Amino acid sequence: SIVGEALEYVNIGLSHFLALPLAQRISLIIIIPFIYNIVWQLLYSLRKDRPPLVFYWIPWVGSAVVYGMKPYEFFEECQKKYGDIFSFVLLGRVMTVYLGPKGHEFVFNAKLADVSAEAAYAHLTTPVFGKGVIFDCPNSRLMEQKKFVKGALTKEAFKSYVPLIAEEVYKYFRDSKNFRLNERTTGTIDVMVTQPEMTIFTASRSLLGKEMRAKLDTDFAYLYSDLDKGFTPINFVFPNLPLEHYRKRDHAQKAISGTYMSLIKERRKNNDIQDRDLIDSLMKNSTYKDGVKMTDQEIANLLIGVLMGGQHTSAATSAWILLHLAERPDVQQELYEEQMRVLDGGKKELTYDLLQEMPLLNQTIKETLRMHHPLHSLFRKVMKDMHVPNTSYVIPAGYHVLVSPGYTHLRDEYFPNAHQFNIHRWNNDSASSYSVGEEVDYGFGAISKGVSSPYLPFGGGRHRCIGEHFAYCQLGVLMSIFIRTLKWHYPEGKTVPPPDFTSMVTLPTGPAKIIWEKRNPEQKIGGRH
Numbered sequence: 305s306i307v308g309e310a311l312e313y314v315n316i317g318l319s320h321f322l323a324l325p326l327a328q329r330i331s332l333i334i335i336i337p338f339i340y341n342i343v344w345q346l347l348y349s350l351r352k353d354r355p356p357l358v359f360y361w362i363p364w365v366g367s368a369v370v371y372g373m374k375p376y377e378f379f380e381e382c383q384k385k386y387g388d389i390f391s392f393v394l395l396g397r398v399m400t401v402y403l404g405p406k407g408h409e410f411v412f413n414a415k416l417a418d419v420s421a422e423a424a425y426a427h428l429t430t431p432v433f434g435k436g437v438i439f440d441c442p443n444s445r446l447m448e449q450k451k452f453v454k455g456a457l458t459k460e461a462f463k464s465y466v467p468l469i470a471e472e473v474y475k476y477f478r479d480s481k482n483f484r485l486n487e488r489t490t491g492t493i494d495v496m497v498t499q500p501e502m503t504i505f506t507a508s509r510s511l512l513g514k515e516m517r518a519k520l521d522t523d524f525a526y527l528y529s530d531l532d533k534g535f536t537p538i539n540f541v542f543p544n545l546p547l548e549h550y551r552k553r554d555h556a557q558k559a560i561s562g563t564y565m566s567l568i569k570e571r572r573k574n575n576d577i578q579d580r581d582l583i584d585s586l587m588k589n590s591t592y593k594d595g596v597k598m599t600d601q602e603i604a605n606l607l608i609g610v611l612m613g614g615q616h617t618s619a620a621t622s623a624w625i626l627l628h629l630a631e632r633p634d635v636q637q638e639l640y641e642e643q644m645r646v647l648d649g650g651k652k653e654l655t656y657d658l659l660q661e662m663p664l665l666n667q668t669i670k671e672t673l674r675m676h677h678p679l680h681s682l683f684r685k686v687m688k689d690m691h692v693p694n695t696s697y698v699i700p701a702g703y704h705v706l707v708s709p710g711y712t713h714l715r716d717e718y719f720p721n722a723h724q725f726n727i728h729r730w731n732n733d734s735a736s737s738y739s740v741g742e743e744v745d746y747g748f749g750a751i752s753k754g755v756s757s758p759y760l761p762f763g764g765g766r767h768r769c770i771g772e773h774f775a776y777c778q779l780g781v782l783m784s785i786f787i788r789t790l791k792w793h794y795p796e797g798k799t800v801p802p803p804d805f806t807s808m809v810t811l812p813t814g815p816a817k818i819i820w821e822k823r824n825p826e827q828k829i830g831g832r833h
């Protein structure tokens with residue numbers, strides 16, 4: 305009974321492996337992990353304390369390509385094959401998707417000890433925004449940061465923001481090359497050019513104030529563009545690569561936060577701290593409950609993240625509203641009549657209160673946010689093994705969970721004829737959102753305890769959006785003026801473009817052009833320029 309010879313031949317075999325030709329070795333260096341990956345998956349399917357895992361050929365890469373380009377189609381296919389809970393490999397990570405309202409609850413309402421947002425996002429956000437805020441801090445700090453920000457987002461603030469936002473829109477109609485309404489009565493625009501510009505101008509003016517708005521008229525504006533490039537999904541895997549893209553980003557964050565700190569210190573020196581904007585508010589109101597004060601650097605960094613986030617969600621959304629209305633002159637017509645009745649033929653000046661009496665306008669935003677959730681996927685890193693209720697499934701620590709309310713937004717089960725733009729599905733239901741029951745406070749105010757609504761444009765739970773009322777205010781003023789001022793339509797043969805899912809926000813694939821026309825050719829916008 306000699307197996308000793310077999311053991312000798314193991315060693316010999318190893319020895320002959322090392323002396324294979326470099327061509328053969330390389331081949332095996334490709335072959336063996338390829339093979340091994342496939343046997344591992346088939347073995348994984350045998351487990352039943354794990355959700356089904358989408359099969360994939362290329363190791364590490366996983367389903368990144370199909371998920372990257374068409375996430376909702378990927379989700380529908382996996383849903384038919386596996387049901388609502390399923391996993392897939394994504395550039396080194398395992399993602400567990402839980403679709404539908406039950407998925408909303410499972411992730412948005414997950415215990416603080418179970419999952420972590422900042423563990424998923426810090427590598428992306430922190431380089432762009434700066435240190436010490438949002439995801440570069442414990443959740444408890446984020447909770448209070450949101451409370452600080454919310455303090456400049458009150459109804460009284462909105463009343464003062466509306467005339468400011470209105471001024472910026474009219475100034476843009478007057479002075480932008482894309483319009484020049486005093487010189488031209490019709491023209492073609494790329495909505496992906498005009499809306500990011502209109503969004504930053506209106507949000508800067510209202511949230512940051514006149515000084516910071518004034519800066520955007522100069523070469524300074526280029527830094528925001530640079531900083532914008534740091535906010536892409538590439539940084540989700542490659543956050544720091546010694547290339548120019550990453551230096552301009554880093555330089556921008558320093559440069560922009562430098563500018564904000566400069567204003568903060570100037571105001572404090574001159575005792576010029578009032579109730580004008582978000583800067584005044586954070587200067588007066590940014591002490592944590594343990595007594596630690598946010599630094600001027602942290603305040604500036606928080607300003608960047610808040611403005612940047614709201615920039616991309618809002619610009620994408622106003623772009624979609626215009627693009628959907630471009631093929632619906634019936635809806636423009638209906639929106640226009642509401643403007644005439646509420647504002648008395650346009651003789652009343654637009655106020656925040658009058659905005660609230662424009663349900664069809666507000667429903668149009670609501671419906672656009674249904675068909676185009678700006679964030680198609682939201683992530684959490686799983687910090688300890690989670691048991692999926694009413695299943696035998698366990699999501700181990702190290703996995704990521706992925707929730708997608710935008711997907712449910714497009715399901716016929718919850719929204720009949722979901723792929724049809726219909727603002728009237730929200731008749732007598734024009735609120736941006738609301739809790740249909742019990743509430744809870746995570747540190748930034750009472751919000752809905754349940755997150756099982758099939759409509760969740762602003763998420764839910766501790767990470768829930770706090771910019772929703774600002775977004776409706778901004779989008780409301782913007783669309784109210786667009787409607788009263790212009791009609792618009794598609795170039796012949798053009799229709800609503802498909803989403804570009806490959807960016808951080810699900811903006812339309814551009815260029816996406818519409819043709820505008822003045823409702824009143826002779827109308828003039830006053831002021832100097």
Ligand code: HEM
Nearest residue numbers: 613614617618621682761762763767768769770771774775
């Ligand atoms: C159409 C407009 C917007 C939509 C649809 C939207 C959507 C969302 C969603 C879904 C989340 C939750 C993310 C998650 O659960 O992982 C969120 C969080 C947040 N958003 Fe918004 N947002 C919008 C505009 C804004 C604006 C205008 C601001 C600021 C002025 C803003 C600031 C924030 C903040 C501070 C959070 C908290 C992030 C966290 O706690 O993890 N958003 N938003």
Ligand SMILES: OC(Cn1cncn1)(Cn1cncn1)c1ccc(F)cc1F
Nearest residue numbers: 438609610612613614617679769771808
């Ligand atoms: O939630 C975001 C970050 N994010 C998550 N997936 C993709 N981007 C986006 N966002 C949501 N509303 C507005 N922006 C965010 C949250 C807070 C924030 F300050 C910035 C920021 F980008």
